[PDB]
């Protein structure tokens, strides 16, 4: 994470170059479909869904399995949650950032003098706005959609 | 096959290295001990020193210099030079020895023998400035820059010094043909070792 903290720390994580999924996965594409719809039915976003699936269920990655409905695409959790109407409208990361934004703005309301968190607010707001600008360049949001603290409160 | 018994080697401190390593001698290093001292490879040491014996015979006896500024090696080198007719210089190597013709003891070898690479820096610089091949008695702390024939072992202990110098005399006089068998040396280890006064 260098883009603001400017520290080149490497806590990233690695995936081996496997092209076909391994054999020891005793579940099939429909079974992982059943489990992922169960999981998101239980109220989890993609990151925690995939973590627990690779953790307790053991399947290393759903990206190693090819979507039946398209030969060129490798199956992903987001696509599956899009299949059944369980993907979210506002992309998950940005919803999280809005939630943290309203959180910090409240704490800041009851605490004006901590300019350190003023700067933090400035940071997280540039973050959300960059993500939103990008997604506008892609068009997965309504074009009139634009940040407001108050609707974030409604969020 | 070993020139000397392995247990003799282990008793001689040949395989005992320091608490340090280097990228250069990762190959020669065998393993580490839980305390910290490093262990060299015995078999590689034996192979390299028999190779060195195969080498040194190709030169003249007198032409080869052997120098040890480390205290523990001075009698091993004098004894080896006596045995093999090589020239030997213990103590403080006079700077400008082979580089300065006006000196009294001017002599230019065709190969060098080095006891401790760290201590014998001056010898290497002189010999290089003459431009000759270099042989070294290295440790897991010595450095492999500017050595044509490095041999790994413990280059501090007196027992190791005498043992390896003895084996070197054995192999050089083997390959020189003056003495064919190993058993013709009636000069045991204690003749090369240091005497504690």
């Amino acid at each position: 994470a260098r883009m603001h903290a400017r520290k080149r720390g490497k806590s990233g994580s690695k995936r081996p170059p496997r092209t076909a999924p391994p054999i020891w996965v005793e579940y099939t594409v429909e079974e992982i479909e059943n489990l992922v719809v169960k999981l998101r039915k239980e109220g989890y976003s993609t990151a925690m869904i995939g973590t627990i699936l690779r953790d307790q269920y053991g399947i290393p990655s759903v990206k190693l399995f090819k979507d039946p409905d398209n030969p060129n695409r490798n199956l992903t959790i987001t696509r599956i949650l899009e299949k059944h109407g369980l993907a979210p409208e506002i992309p998950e990361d940005l919803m999280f950032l809005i939630r943290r934004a309203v959180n910090l703005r409240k704490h800041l309301e009851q605490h004006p003098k901590d300019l350190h968190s003023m700067r933090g607010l400035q940071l997280i707001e540039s973050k959300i706005r960059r993500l939103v600008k990008y997604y506008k360049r892609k068009g997965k949001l309504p074009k009139n959609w634009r940040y407001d603290p108050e609707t974030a409160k409604l969020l | 096959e070993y020139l000397v018994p392995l247990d003799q080697y282990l008793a001689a401190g040949v395989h005992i290295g320091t608490q340090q390593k280097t990228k250069d001698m990762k190959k020669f290093i065998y393993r580490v001990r839980q305390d910290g001292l490093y262990v060299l490879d015995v078999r590689k040491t034996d192979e390299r020193l028999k190779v060195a014996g195969k080498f040194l015979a190709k030169f003249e006896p007198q032409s080869i210099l052997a120098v040890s500024v480390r205290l523990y090696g001075q009698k091993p080198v004098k004894k080896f030079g006596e045995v093999t007719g090589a020239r030997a210089i213990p103590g403080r190597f006079l700077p400008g020895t082979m580089t300065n013709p006006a000196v009294k003891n001017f002599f230019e070898p065709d190969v060098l023998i080095v006891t401790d690479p760290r201590a014998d820096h001056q010898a290497m610089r002189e010999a290089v400035e003459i431009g000759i091949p270099i042989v070294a008695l290295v440790d897991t702390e010595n450095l492999l820059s500017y050595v044509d024939l490095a041999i790994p072992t413990n280059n501090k202990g007196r027992k190791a010094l005498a043992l390896i110098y003895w084996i070197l005399a054995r192999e050089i006089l083997y390959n020189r043909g003056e003495i064919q068998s190993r058993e013709d040396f009636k000069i045991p280890v204690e003749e090369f070792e240091m005497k504690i006064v």
Partner: protein
């Protein structure tokens, strides 16, 4: 020519060889100049080289580049000292440069000449201009650089008859290196003649540092040293 062999004989039966290299030149095992350089030997007795290249002794083949009067400040006066820099070479790809300290003109001159003899070097030569390409050793075979201090000098092949397009110090060095047409450019100040000379030396040495195919040898006619 015959006079050079006479000089070689005079020194041969006068000089007593001390170094390890003195034998193979006095005993005749070595007779090629490039014999010394190839193997990676050393040189310390200047008397060696005139045996194989007595032509260095020619009065014209020795060049005095510059004479500096560097002072030393003492508690009890100003003690001058002559630092003289001079070059000596043959016109077939061997040259050398020397710096000699002294109390008079002569002593510094002699010591500098001896040192320069000791720093003899081999010179590749060719023709790699974009126009001439005549395969002869009438120029540096290809572009090179030489760095010393502030000064960095780049030498570029040129067509024949162009002459030495370079400052006077480089002119003398290249006249005594056996080269006669080259473009030259300099970065850094060239008023300190000593560094200019040393930089040209570095460049000439760097010529041999360039990787080459035999194809290139036959294309520019790369004469390694003596033509």
């Amino acid at each position: 020519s015959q006079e050079w062999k006479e000089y070689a004989k005079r020194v041969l039966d006068e000089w007593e060889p001390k170094t390890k290299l003195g034998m193979m030149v006095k005993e005749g095992q070595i007779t090629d100049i490039h014999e010394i350089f190839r193997r990676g030997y050393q040189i310390k007795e200047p008397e060696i080289i005139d045996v194989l290249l007595p032509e260095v002794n020619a009065r014209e083949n020795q060049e005095v580049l510059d004479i500096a009067l560097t002072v030393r400040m003492t508690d009890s006066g100003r003690r001058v000292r002559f630092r003289v820099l001079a070059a000596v070479g043959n016109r077939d790809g061997y040259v050398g440069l020397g710096i000699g300290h002294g109390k008079e003109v002569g002593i510094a001159i002699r010591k500098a000449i001896n040192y320069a003899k000791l720093n003899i070097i081999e010179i590749k030569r060719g023709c790699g201009s974009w126009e001439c390409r005549c395969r002869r050793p009438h120029s540096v075979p290809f572009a090179v650089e030489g760095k010393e201090g502030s000064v960095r000098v780049r030498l570029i092949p040129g067509p024949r008859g162009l002459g030495l397009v370079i400052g006077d110090v480089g002119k003398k060095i290249l006249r005594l290196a056996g080269v006669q047409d080259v473009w030259s450019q300099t970065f850094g100040e060239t008023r300190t003649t000593v560094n200019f000379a040393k930089a040209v030396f570095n460049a000439l040495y760097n010529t041999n540092r360039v990787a080459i195919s035999p194809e290139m040898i036959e294309r520019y006619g790369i004469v390694v040293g003596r033509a």
